[PDB]
Symmetry: D3
Subunit: 160 residues, 6 copies
């Protein structure tokens, strides 16, 4: 069913934390990570969504080769990382590239190897460890179904 | 005589197929090539041209060091790659950087070494070999004169 | 006191000379340097400033990891490189990242090691050596004080 | 059952064709490829084997991140690429990393997606297209079983 | 006083865990880290030392630009990272480049900024978190004096 | 006529100054350059030569893509850079790859564009500018002829 555009803010392997300014469209170097970690996958947000906090819904995209910040990728959801940090709840849709048969075998979170999900989860739990006031409290994984529903709501919030 | 601006969509050496969306201005990861090949030169399109198919005229730009997708380069034509694929005819203007005396010795397609033209041609002939329905039929090289004429028409089509 | 946004045009380590077109917002490959040199730090301009010559005030930003052309970084001044070239006077504010405590020990030009200031100065003195008509005549360093003053003036020129 | 050491000569993504000199141990830049292609996976030879032609048996290793020429990787076979070129028969064992549970799901050639095998095969069929006298005639895939047997013989040839 | 040669096994920024085999001299891809982390500095061992476990003493080397695995760097000690893992005690001498005046200001562990020591410590505490049976228990910092003493013993063990 | 092996110590684009230790065969990080410069071509020495100073004759090799330190390349001379520094005379043979027809049009120093020879010369004249006691006094270009002669002598010194 569902598919959308993700705007990659941060390439796999990067320790610079880029972000897109959501009115001006410009890309911004928010900060350099305080921990010796790097983004586990290409990271961004779903174009035309609105989360709880006036921010578009976050997205992880699985790619063979990282992209550049600002790049659009047409993607589809396979699961969702649920996380509660110091600004409270925050979710990240796990995605593969849409209409690329090389990802056809990846249909739900069951299809992504554990060592990969754990590596991703390990990054978000620890990446802000050396940043005062900043912490993480929940962190877990849910299936394409819950991913799809959270997307749907954020699309509807974006239209209101 | 003629010179124009090229928007590089894809850097030399890249296997990610970026493209510029021509209304929104945004850059897009179209697909990752199915063959183990990589763009033989920096690749883009001539700004303010319109081809037969509502798409700006394609350009190859010879550069010492690859640029980033979206980067403008002022360029001049030295020849043109004529190719007929599954969507029919499609041409690619061969360029060097404008007003850069290091390229002064390159004035027509005679001035580009054969092994380079062949490498470029070999890329377009084979890059879509593992992509169903997609094939290539003609593929040859023509001089700065024919390049200049096709540009001129595409500039005039862009003004209508 | 003072702090501002810098738009990085050229990453540390690059030999391609990118520049932002100031009306269109687009990024441009101006030229590939003629000397075997690479920008000693990330290089751009202070957003919303206007110099003597209708061009925004130049900026050097010290970063742990280079950014991409077009990226915004919030920054604060610690000194200024004064230089007179073939188009006359031209200054470059030395900046560190704003609100990043890892840079708290850098408060004025005294706090940047000499070998670094000399490396930067060596780049601007020599980078145009193989470029006809282009030369450099003055080149020296001044403190956060004078930096702050030149910024203020350029901000005020931008509002007129 | 079987597992061995591979010495990577050429990293995934490289167009430089490095080779190890088999007496001196030194690494050598044989040639830069004439086609705009790059090695589809990390490429080398199985340490302590001897093929038909006094050369150690060739190996492709599947890795998450490319290595450096000269690097040893402990590996296990999953299949074999059979190829007949201008020097006649030549085979390449397809391998994954030994004792790394992240590759446990890859047990025979059935387990490697078609688009990957085809990409590899496409590289070896075309990489020497622009090299006079050099051609390719057979090229196909066989299973872990045949891979294992060819290894065994090359190990025994190495002991004679 | 003391200075020695370090063989860098692993460049800053790498997630591949290279190691030197200490008889054969050859470099080996041990494993790819299970956590989304990357070596916080260039990492290796002190040439001609012998630790408690028949392995040369580990070293961290602070460098402006990462080297290649196998590269020798002449270095001097400024402190030492004391850590107890699953194989028991294991120490890591913190070094700067020898005879390089750019590092003259770094004379003991007091001279290395806290955010750097913490980043390094954070790496060794967490890098093996997703690796069964592997854990970390102590982890702290000591001064150039203790570094110098542990080196001295390992040099003497190497001569017996 | 003449052709030989070059051992590349330093890749084009690098600022780390690698060097091969000539007895042990090991590669060494000598220093990071003090100026914001990077080696204009791949740089090494002619294998089995001996200069005036017990050091093998230096070599520049022109390549499409840089190699790794320690890599051998079979090469042929097209000219020589003569230079006198603080340790007196020091020469560097300009080479292209042997038996590669893509370089057949480069037969003597006349065949290398001026902007290239000047770039190379500019690097050796300035790269040590910020290094106390270190300077450069002569620096010029001579033809394949003189190159061939200096090689011959160094080969003969190597055999004595």
């Amino acid at each position: 069913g569902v598919q959308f555009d993700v705007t990659i803010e941060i390439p796999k392997g990067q320790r610079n934390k880029y972000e897109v300014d959501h009115e001006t469209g410009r890309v911004r170097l928010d900060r350099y990570l305080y921990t010796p970690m790097a983004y586990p996958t290409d990271y961004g947000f779903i174009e035309d969504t609105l989360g709880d906090d006036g921010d578009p819904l976050d997205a992880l995209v699985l790619l063979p080769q990282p992209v550049f910040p600002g790049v659009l990728v047409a993607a589809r959801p396979v699961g969702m990382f649920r996380m509660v940090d110091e600004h409270g709840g925050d979710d990240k849709v796990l995605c593969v590239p849409a209409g690329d048969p090389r990802w056809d075998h990846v249909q739900d979170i069951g299809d992504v190897p554990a060592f990969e999900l754990d590596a991703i989860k390990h990054f978000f739990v620890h990446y802000k460890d050396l940043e005062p006031g900043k912490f993480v409290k929940a962190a877990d994984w849910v299936d394409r179904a819950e991913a799809e529903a959270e997307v749907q709501r954020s699309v509807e919030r974006f239209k209101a």
